[PDB]
Structures are given as C-alpha cells and as structure tokens.
Amino acid sequence: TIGIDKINFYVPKYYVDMAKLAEARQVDPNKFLIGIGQTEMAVSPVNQDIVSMGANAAKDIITDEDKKKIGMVIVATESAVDAAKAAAVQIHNLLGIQPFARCFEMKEACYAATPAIQLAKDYLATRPNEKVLVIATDTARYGLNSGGEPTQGAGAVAMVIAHNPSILALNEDAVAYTEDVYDFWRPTGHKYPLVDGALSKDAYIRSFQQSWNEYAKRQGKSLADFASLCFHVPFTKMGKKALESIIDNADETTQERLRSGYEDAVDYNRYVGNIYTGSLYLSLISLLENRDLQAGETIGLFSYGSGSVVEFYSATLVEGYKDHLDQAAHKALLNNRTEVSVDAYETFFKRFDDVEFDEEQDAVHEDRHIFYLSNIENNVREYHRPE
Amino acid sequence: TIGIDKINFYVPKYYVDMAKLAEARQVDPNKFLIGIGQTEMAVSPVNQDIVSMGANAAKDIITDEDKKKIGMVIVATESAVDAAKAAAVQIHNLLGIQPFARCFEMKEACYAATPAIQLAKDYLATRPNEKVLVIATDTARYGLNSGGEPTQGAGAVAMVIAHNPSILALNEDAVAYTEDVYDFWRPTGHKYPLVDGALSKDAYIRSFQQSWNEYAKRQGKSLADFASLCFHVPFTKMGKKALESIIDNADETTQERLRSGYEDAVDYNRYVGNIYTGSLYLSLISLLENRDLQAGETIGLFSYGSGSVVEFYSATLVEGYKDHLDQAAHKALLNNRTEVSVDAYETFFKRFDDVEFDEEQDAVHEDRHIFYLSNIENNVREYHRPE
Ligand SMILES: CC(=O)CC(=O)SCCNC(=O)CCNC(=O)[C@H](O)C(C)(C)COP(=O)(O)OP(=O)(O)OC[C@H]1O[C@@H](n2cnc3c(N)ncnc32)[C@@H](O)[C@@H]1OP(=O)(O)O
Ligand SMILES: CC(=O)CC(=O)SCCNC(=O)CCNC(=O)[C@H](O)C(C)(C)COP(=O)(O)OP(=O)(O)OC[C@H]1O[C@@H](n2cnc3c(N)ncnc32)[C@@H](O)[C@@H]1OP(=O)(O)O
The missing domain is CATH 3.40.47.10 (Thiolase/Chalcone synthase)
Incomplete structure (x- = not known):
C-alpha cells in the first residue's frame, strides 16, 4: 500500500472572535456561530505568507531521512505569490531536501491537494524507497465587508506520502x-x-x-x-x-x-x-x-x-496510526493563539494586502522557533529559519 | 508501454520579422538571426488567449473516442489568466471531454509540461483504457524594449498520453x-x-x-x-x-x-x-x-x-510513428501566417496587455475554423467555437 505516512498543519498565531466580528458587522452572533458554523477566524500577520506557513506545517514531520528520500515537493495553492516560480522550490530550499526532486505548484481552486496526493501515490508505485511532500497552503481573503468575509481563514497542511504508510492507505x-x-x-x-x-x-x-x-x-x-x-x-x-x-x-x-x-x-x-x-x-x-x-x-x-x-x-x-498524530500539539497550537479585536484584524488585513512589514505589530521576536517572512528585497522574499 | 500517442502545436496567425525588429531596435539583424538564432517571432492578437491556443493545439488530435477515454486534463502554464480556476476546466469544456476527469493546472516556469506527462504516465499504469490530455500553453511577453524582447513568443503544444503509444514510449x-x-x-x-x-x-x-x-x-x-x-x-x-x-x-x-x-x-x-x-x-x-x-x-x-x-x-x-505526425500541416501552419510590421506588433503588444478587443484588427472573420476569445463579460471569457 501507499498513503498518508505523516501529516500536520499550521495556522497563524492570531485569530478574531466570530461573535465579535458579527457585532462589528451588524449581525446576530448566532448567524456566524450556528448559521455558518464558525467560531474563530485565523488572522494573517504580514510575517506569514504561504511559504512560511507551508514550511511550518512541514518542519515537524520530516526527519533527516525524509530529506534524503523525498523525490517530489508539490505545493497545492490558489494564493500563489509568483506566476512563474513555484512555492515548492522555496519550501524545498527552506527544508534542505535532497536536490534531485521535482518541485512544482498545482492549481484548481480548493481542489488541488487531492491530485497532488493521488499522483504522489501513482508516482511512488514503481519507486518504493522514495517519498513525496505535498503542501496545501492558502489564505482565504474575500475582502472587508464582503459576502465571503465570514468564511475567511489561513493555514497549511503537510502530508508525507509513502509506501507502507503509518496513517492511511489511499485506496x-x-x-x-x-x-x-x-x-x-x-x-x-x-x-x-x-x-x-x-x-x-x-x-x-x-x-x-x-x-x-x-x-x-x-x-x-x-x-x-x-x-x-x-x-x-x-x-x-x-x-x-x-x-x-x-x-x-x-x-x-x-x-x-x-x-x-x-x-x-x-x-x-x-x-x-x-x-x-x-x-x-x-x-x-x-x-x-x-x-x-x-x-x-x-x-x-x-x-x-x-x-x-x-x-x-x-x-x-x-494500525497504530494514533501514535503518528499529535492531538495535544494541535490543541496547544489553537489554544495558544492570541485574540485580536475587529479593528486589529482589519489593520492586519490591510497590511497583508500590501505586505507592509512592522516587526512590532507582527511581534516577530515571538517567532524565533518558526519560519517567517522577514523582508522583501529586490523583489525576493527573505525568510527567518527556526533558530 | 506508455507514452506520447499524439502531439500537435498551435501558434497565432501573426509573426514579426526578426530582421525588421532588430532595425527598429538599432542592432544588426544578425545579432538576432545568428547571435540569438531566431528568425520570426509570434505575435498574439487579443483574440488568442492561453485557453483558445490550448484548445486549438488539441482539437485536431482528439477523436470522439478520446473524449470518452480521457481521465485527466492537465494545463502547464506560467501565463495563467486566473489565480483559482484552472484553464484545464475551460479547455475540458471547449473540447467536450467526458465529465469524470481531473482538471487542474501545474506551474513551475517553463518546466511544468514535463511533470504533467510523467505523472500522466504514472497515472495510467493501472488504467489501461484511459488517456490523459496534457496542454502546454503560454505567452512569453518581456515588454517593449526589454532585454528579453527578442525571445518573446506565444503558442501551445498538446499531447495525448496513452497505452501502446503511436509515437514515443516514455522511459x-x-x-x-x-x-x-x-x-x-x-x-x-x-x-x-x-x-x-x-x-x-x-x-x-x-x-x-x-x-x-x-x-x-x-x-x-x-x-x-x-x-x-x-x-x-x-x-x-x-x-x-x-x-x-x-x-x-x-x-x-x-x-x-x-x-x-x-x-x-x-x-x-x-x-x-x-x-x-x-x-x-x-x-x-x-x-x-x-x-x-x-x-x-x-x-x-x-x-x-x-x-x-x-x-x-x-x-x-x-514502429510507424511517421504515420502519426503532421509535417505538411505544421509547415502549412507556419507558412500561412501574415507578417506584421514592427508598429503593428507594438500595437498588438499593448492591446494584449489590456485585453482590448477589436474585431477588424484581429481579423476575427478569418478565424471561423478555430477557437478564439470573442469577449469578456461580467469577468467571464467567451469563446467562439470552430464552425
Ligand atoms: C470559496 C470556496 O471554498 C468555494 C466553495 O467551497 S463552494 C461552497 C462554499 N461557498 C463559499 O464559502 C463561498 C463564499 N461564502 C459566501 O458567500 C458567504 O460567506 C456565505 C454564503 C457562506 C454566507 O452568506 P450570508 O448571506 O452571510 O448568510 P446566509 O447564506 O444568509 O445564511 C447563513 C446561515 O445563517 C443562518 N441564520 C441566519 N441568521 C441566523 C441567526 N441569527 N441565528 C442562527 N442562524 C441564522 C441561516 O439562515 C443560514 O444557514 P441555513 O442555510 O441553514 O439557512
Ligand atoms: C525565460 C526562460 O525560459 C529562462 C531560461 O530559459 S534561461 C535561458 C535564457 N533566458 C532567457 O531566454 C530570457 C531572457 N532573455 C534575455 O535576457 C536576452 O534576450 C538574451 C540574454 C537572450 C540576449 O540579450 P542581449 O543583450 O541581446 O544578449 P547578447 O549579449 O546580445 O547575446 C546575444 C548574442 O548576440 C551575438 N552577437 C552580438 N552581435 C552580433 C552580430 N551582429 N552578429 C552575430 N552575433 C552577434 C553574440 O555575441 C551573443 O551571443 P554569444 O554568446 O553567442 O556571442
């Protein structure tokens, strides 16, 4: 069998309260909490783009051996930062994966991490000692006061696809x-x-x-x-x-x-x-x-x-898949976030569109252990690596 | 065995003469003709976008049977018209391929048609009665007077991947x-x-x-x-x-x-x-x-x-691959274009940037037998279909 061997997610360290967004938007809190079914919305600081969130989801599950064995890095996104240069390349670089690997993006709105994992499996059919890294990474940004706004979010999921996988065989x-x-x-x-x-x-x-x-x-x-x-x-x-x-x-x-x-x-x-x-x-x-x-x-x-x-x-x-998930870690990751007011979320939204850095507002000193977008210079994104 | 069963390309019906571009740029023609090694550059009318070119490369090579047998339609491009909706869906529709098919784009500058066909091969290993359509489609546009200008071009190439391929077995x-x-x-x-x-x-x-x-x-x-x-x-x-x-x-x-x-x-x-x-x-x-x-x-x-x-x-x-190529049609396709002057090519250049239609400049009456972009309305691209 071939399937999901390791899998993890990352979301940015801030969220806004859906009851609070609703008051701000002249609607009954329960319209969002029960009607739409959403309680807290992830808020993107400028210092996370798709590549950092992507690297962040990935960094905890890939071991030094994976780096050697991974033969494709596939990024699924509809939030691309380049029309030509695949996010897969930068992530591949940030994670120090072996050089002999295909890197590319796939795109078809929210669908693309599916063809990525299914085709990683078909890829591996005849390459049993290899692995594939598929990252889903995206920022659902509909605009302030838009119809879509209530459903906005941001994050990424990383899957390592392999033979004899420890979590799920893809049928x-x-x-x-x-x-x-x-x-x-x-x-x-x-x-x-x-x-x-x-x-x-x-x-x-x-x-x-x-x-x-x-x-x-x-x-x-x-x-x-x-x-x-x-x-x-x-x-x-x-x-x-x-x-x-x-x-x-x-x-x-x-x-x-x-x-x-x-x-x-x-x-x-x-x-x-x-x-x-x-x-x-x-x-x-x-x-x-x-x-x-x-x-x-x-x-x-x-x-x-x-x-x-x-x-x-x-x-x-x-069997034993429970040993390969981190429930406590994913609970710590959501609970450890910091709530921001509706005004603060909006500031963040506007800063993110233009990529206006502010190291004090994004509180980057907190992020010593994660990848983050530290600067753009000569139209090249620079990243901080985990210390 | 699995490989390229069918292949065809399409370019737009206008080129500019590279000797004449050189004179308009004040270099010796031979800097383009021998130095760079390019003699005619394709000129994209507004009516030819990556979707129409794509559909044109493919229409001559898919039979009614192919339409039933194609299980994925993959578009390789770095000239995408949409951040979310894959051109593959649009092409799948123009060509009337059966609906149970993965449609998606792949992206990595000029590289993406390779992983497109290699993963199609891997996809087909256990699916002996399916086919895959891979379309590469792009407009290389560097800008009027840019360093890249002499290497501009526009076109698409289409490939049907299948078992028992007529042309090339993929190793x-x-x-x-x-x-x-x-x-x-x-x-x-x-x-x-x-x-x-x-x-x-x-x-x-x-x-x-x-x-x-x-x-x-x-x-x-x-x-x-x-x-x-x-x-x-x-x-x-x-x-x-x-x-x-x-x-x-x-x-x-x-x-x-x-x-x-x-x-x-x-x-x-x-x-x-x-x-x-x-x-x-x-x-x-x-x-x-x-x-x-x-x-x-x-x-x-x-x-x-x-x-x-x-x-x-x-x-x-x-064996027999020669019976499956279209040399005369490809010579015909190249020879049947109309040379435009350098002023004309610059007018086409600015028109393309802004998607400014003009039916007479694009001579759309000429294009009765091909797909072409006829209009954008409420942000939706409309296509003329082959009559
Ligand atoms: C982007 C994608 O990823 C695309 C897709 O997946 S396709 C499917 C998903 N679509 C999207 O997410 C597209 C973007 N989203 C949107 O347009 C909007 O945010 C939305 C359509 C999801 C919300 O629309 P809206 O006009 O704000 O709310 P509306 O559709 O009126 O109804 C929301 C719910 O509120 C509920 N309701 C209204 N007021 C309520 C209240 N005070 N208390 C409890 N329930 C309430 C219900 O009426 C309604 O749910 P039901 O269908 O159960 O009736
Ligand atoms: C986009 C991609 O797809 C990226 C890639 O693949 S990487 C491949 C290359 N990159 C690109 O194609 C995109 C960018 N293109 C460019 O930057 C430029 O158009 C270019 C580098 C192709 C040429 O720029 P330029 O300033 O005209 O370069 P230039 O120094 O003139 O080189 C052109 C040739 O002219 C030749 N030469 C100059 N005058 C000449 C003359 N009168 N007669 C004959 N030869 C002449 C050669 O000197 C020189 O090449 P050689 O190395 O063979 O000598």
Whole structure:
C-alpha cells in the first residue's frame, strides 16, 4: 500500500472572535456561530505568507531521512505569490531536501491537494524507497465587508506520502467530476475572488452528488460501507448541507455514525476558517485526532474546488496510526493563539494586502522557533529559519 | 508501454520579422538571426488567449473516442489568466471531454509540461483504457524594449498520453534537479518577468549538467547511447550553448550526430520564439518531423524552468510513428501566417496587455475554423467555437 505516512498543519498565531466580528458587522452572533458554523477566524500577520506557513506545517514531520528520500515537493495553492516560480522550490530550499526532486505548484481552486496526493501515490508505485511532500497552503481573503468575509481563514497542511504508510492507505478508487460553472474565480488583476454566494452552495452539492453517485456505482459501495465521511470545509455548515443531501435514504445506524464522524471532522476547522486546498485535509486531521476509529475502518473523502472540480475517494486507517498524530500539539497550537479585536484584524488585513512589514505589530521576536517572512528585497522574499 | 500517442502545436496567425525588429531596435539583424538564432517571432492578437491556443493545439488530435477515454486534463502554464480556476476546466469544456476527469493546472516556469506527462504516465499504469490530455500553453511577453524582447513568443503544444503509444514510449529513467536561484521570476502584480539575463544562461546550463550527470550515473549511460537530444528552447542558441558544454568529451561521431539532431530539433522554434512550457515539446515535434530517426532509437530530453527546476528523461521511437505526425500541416501552419510590421506588433503588444478587443484588427472573420476569445463579460471569457 501507499498513503498518508505523516501529516500536520499550521495556522497563524492570531485569530478574531466570530461573535465579535458579527457585532462589528451588524449581525446576530448566532448567524456566524450556528448559521455558518464558525467560531474563530485565523488572522494573517504580514510575517506569514504561504511559504512560511507551508514550511511550518512541514518542519515537524520530516526527519533527516525524509530529506534524503523525498523525490517530489508539490505545493497545492490558489494564493500563489509568483506566476512563474513555484512555492515548492522555496519550501524545498527552506527544508534542505535532497536536490534531485521535482518541485512544482498545482492549481484548481480548493481542489488541488487531492491530485497532488493521488499522483504522489501513482508516482511512488514503481519507486518504493522514495517519498513525496505535498503542501496545501492558502489564505482565504474575500475582502472587508464582503459576502465571503465570514468564511475567511489561513493555514497549511503537510502530508508525507509513502509506501507502507503509518496513517492511511489511499485506496485505488478515486473518481473525479468536472463541470464548468461560475461559482467562484479570481481573474489575474483581482485581489479578491468573484463569488456567486448561492450558486457556490449549489455547485458544491451537485459536485459531491455527481462524484458520490458515480463512485458508489463503480465500486458497488454505499454509505453503510464507511466509518466516516470527510469533506472539504469552506465553512462547517457547508459539509453538513452536503451530507444531509445524500443520507436521507441511509438506515439509522449509518446516519448516526456519519453525522457524528462529521462533527469530529469539523472540530478544528471551526476555529480556523476556510483554508482552501488545506480545508479537506485539516478536517482529516481533526477527524483522526477527535474520533477513535479503529485500524481497518474506511473513510470516504470528498474534495471540492470551485470552477469546478470534485472528487470522491476512500482511505483505510493503519494500525497504530494514533501514535503518528499529535492531538495535544494541535490543541496547544489553537489554544495558544492570541485574540485580536475587529479593528486589529482589519489593520492586519490591510497590511497583508500590501505586505507592509512592522516587526512590532507582527511581534516577530515571538517567532524565533518558526519560519517567517522577514523582508522583501529586490523583489525576493527573505525568510527567518527556526533558530 | 506508455507514452506520447499524439502531439500537435498551435501558434497565432501573426509573426514579426526578426530582421525588421532588430532595425527598429538599432542592432544588426544578425545579432538576432545568428547571435540569438531566431528568425520570426509570434505575435498574439487579443483574440488568442492561453485557453483558445490550448484548445486549438488539441482539437485536431482528439477523436470522439478520446473524449470518452480521457481521465485527466492537465494545463502547464506560467501565463495563467486566473489565480483559482484552472484553464484545464475551460479547455475540458471547449473540447467536450467526458465529465469524470481531473482538471487542474501545474506551474513551475517553463518546466511544468514535463511533470504533467510523467505523472500522466504514472497515472495510467493501472488504467489501461484511459488517456490523459496534457496542454502546454503560454505567452512569453518581456515588454517593449526589454532585454528579453527578442525571445518573446506565444503558442501551445498538446499531447495525448496513452497505452501502446503511436509515437514515443516514455522511459523509466527520469531524474530531476532543483536548485533555488533568482534567474527569472514574476511576483504577483508584475505583468513582465523579472530577469537576470546572464544568470539565467548560467542556471540553465548548470541545471542541464546536474541533471545530465545524475541521469548518466543512475542509468549507466553516455551521450553515445542517444540518437539525438532534445532541449528546452528559450532561443535556439541557448540549447546549442548547453549542448556544446557537455559533448567535448565525446567521439567525433556522437558529436556530429547530436549537433545535427539539435538542428532538426530547432527548425520550427526558429519561426515562433520562446513558448515556455511548450518550447521543449514544440522542439520535440520539429525533431520527429524534420529528422529521420528510426523506430527503436532513443531521444534524450532536457526540460527546464527558471527558479529553477530541470529534468532529464529518455523516450523511444515507436514502429510507424511517421504515420502519426503532421509535417505538411505544421509547415502549412507556419507558412500561412501574415507578417506584421514592427508598429503593428507594438500595437498588438499593448492591446494584449489590456485585453482590448477589436474585431477588424484581429481579423476575427478569418478565424471561423478555430477557437478564439470573442469577449469578456461580467469577468467571464467567451469563446467562439470552430464552425
Ligand atoms: C470559496 C470556496 O471554498 C468555494 C466553495 O467551497 S463552494 C461552497 C462554499 N461557498 C463559499 O464559502 C463561498 C463564499 N461564502 C459566501 O458567500 C458567504 O460567506 C456565505 C454564503 C457562506 C454566507 O452568506 P450570508 O448571506 O452571510 O448568510 P446566509 O447564506 O444568509 O445564511 C447563513 C446561515 O445563517 C443562518 N441564520 C441566519 N441568521 C441566523 C441567526 N441569527 N441565528 C442562527 N442562524 C441564522 C441561516 O439562515 C443560514 O444557514 P441555513 O442555510 O441553514 O439557512
Ligand atoms: C525565460 C526562460 O525560459 C529562462 C531560461 O530559459 S534561461 C535561458 C535564457 N533566458 C532567457 O531566454 C530570457 C531572457 N532573455 C534575455 O535576457 C536576452 O534576450 C538574451 C540574454 C537572450 C540576449 O540579450 P542581449 O543583450 O541581446 O544578449 P547578447 O549579449 O546580445 O547575446 C546575444 C548574442 O548576440 C551575438 N552577437 C552580438 N552581435 C552580433 C552580430 N551582429 N552578429 C552575430 N552575433 C552577434 C553574440 O555575441 C551573443 O551571443 P554569444 O554568446 O553567442 O556571442
């Protein structure tokens, strides 16, 4: 088997309170907390871009041996800082991975970390001693006072894909569905997505149902065959609308289990917000750490990207996987953040658009142990390495 | 076996004469004709964007059956029109390929068409009835009077990867080499590449040597094993400088053959200019079509992207490949263009930058048999389809 061997995330060290953002925006707090299903929104300091967050997610799981064995670094992003130079190259450099490796970005809105991991697995079929690093890294920034704003977030997920993986085998059953639609897109020149709010909800649910139905059909499986489903999470309620749309005809045991998995799966996302390519895979971590699935059980995964493309595949838990997740570490990482007011979040938002550094506001002296964007000079990003 | 089953390229219907550009820039024509090695530069009308060019390279080579069999559509480009929505979705739609297909872009300067086809190969290992469509599509635009100007070009190359390929079997010997360098890049916000002209000649050549050296070591091979070599062509001279840096330690015979190969390999490129992701594969078409390689012989391929990643793999010519190329159509395509003056080319240049339509300047009436960009409305690009 080949699958997810190691996996970790990172989010920036600040968040804003969703109840507070709501007061600021003239809406009932419960519209965000219950209606949208989000409790705290990640806030980007200028000193984290996609590369640092990316390196940060990666640095704890890659050992000196991985550096030697990794044959591709693949970055999944719709928040690119270059039109030509792949983020994969800088991250590859920051992590000191061996030179004989393909580095590149993949792009298809929030979908791309899926083709990255699936194709890492196909890559490794005939290269058994090698490994692949796939990083999802993104900043969902819709604009201040926008329709999208409540669902904003930022972070990254790192997966090391390998033979005989310690966490999840990726099964050979992925099926993909593409349908050209204008739910969401960001033409060059645009800081913020164009978004058709209602259409995107429809597009998502259609994409899921087309993918699921076809998957069920090719594999002869049904919902009863899954311990849990895991969904791309633009906001926790979205995955729920989509699940409820296909589970009406499942029996009661299956509904109780899949609904409940779902709750476990969106536990982290609630405190972070949408992270585009990483959202699914963040929800995967949340699931694995908050639920107690047994080795041998099967997870159904739904990956969506605006525009649109969706995919459903399954993955099977490996024995002892619990030993390869860091629940306490991911809880420390969310709890240890610092709340900022709505005014402070807005300052941050405006600084981030223009990349206006301020070492005192980003409080960079705190970041001695992480990678961070320290400066731009002659149009080249400079990074601080972990001390 | 798995490799390139079908391949075709498209360039826009206008070129400018390189001797005439030289006079407008006040250098001796021969600095472009021999020094850089380029004779005609492609001129992009507004009506030809990366999606229409892409669809044009592909439309002549996919049958109704292909449409049912294609399981992924991958676009390699550093000239993307959207930060989120992949051009692959748009092309998938124009060409009416069946909906159960992964569509996504890959990005790494001029390199991305290589990982696109190599991962398509790996994708197909266990899927004997599927095909993959890979489209390289780019506009190399450095700016009026920039150092890069003479090496501008625009086009696309399209490749159907499949089992039992008609043309080339892709070997199991690729090795890539990543080195983080600032030779060429384009931060978001820049319409033109930031380039360090001299560094990039060095980084190119260094990348080729590293990759070539590692390949030889791993595969126990030398240049004498190769019927011909084929390189990423940013200008015909660059590939000749990279080649000459490694064949000095080779018997007169390997030297004569490889240098001659090179020359067939760059015939077409001479009349188009740089096409980033498509340059190596354009050059591949020109080699298969101008030279008389025998079934069974072996081509050694070098692929390069700024920033930088490079790669060396091999490919073997299939019995009957000649019955599967379109030499006359490709000669026709090049010969059927209309020369524009330098003023005209500059007008086309500024029009492209701003996407200013003009049906008469682009002579769209002429384009009844091809895809072209007819309009942008509510931020959505509209396409004319082949009548
Ligand atoms: C970007 C992507 O990643 C794209 C995708 O995945 S596609 C699917 C996801 N779409 C997106 O995230 C696109 C961007 N998002 C948006 O446009 C918006 O932020 C949004 C559509 C998610 C929110 O829209 P909105 O107009 O602020 O809220 P609205 O759609 O009115 O409803 C939100 C919820 O509030 C709830 N409700 C309203 N007031 C409430 C209150 N006071 N208490 C409790 N619930 C309340 C519900 O009415 C509603 O949920 P239901 O569907 O269960 O009725
Ligand atoms: C974008 C990418 O795809 C990046 C890469 O692949 S790395 C590959 C190279 N980089 C690029 O293609 C992009 C950048 N392009 C450029 O910077 C430039 O257009 C360029 C470096 C190609 C040429 O710039 P330039 O100032 O015209 O360079 P220049 O010094 O004139 O070199 C051109 C040649 O003119 C020749 N020479 C000068 N006058 C001549 C004349 N009258 N007759 C014949 N030869 C002449 C040669 O001297 C010189 O090359 P040699 O090394 O063969 O002598």
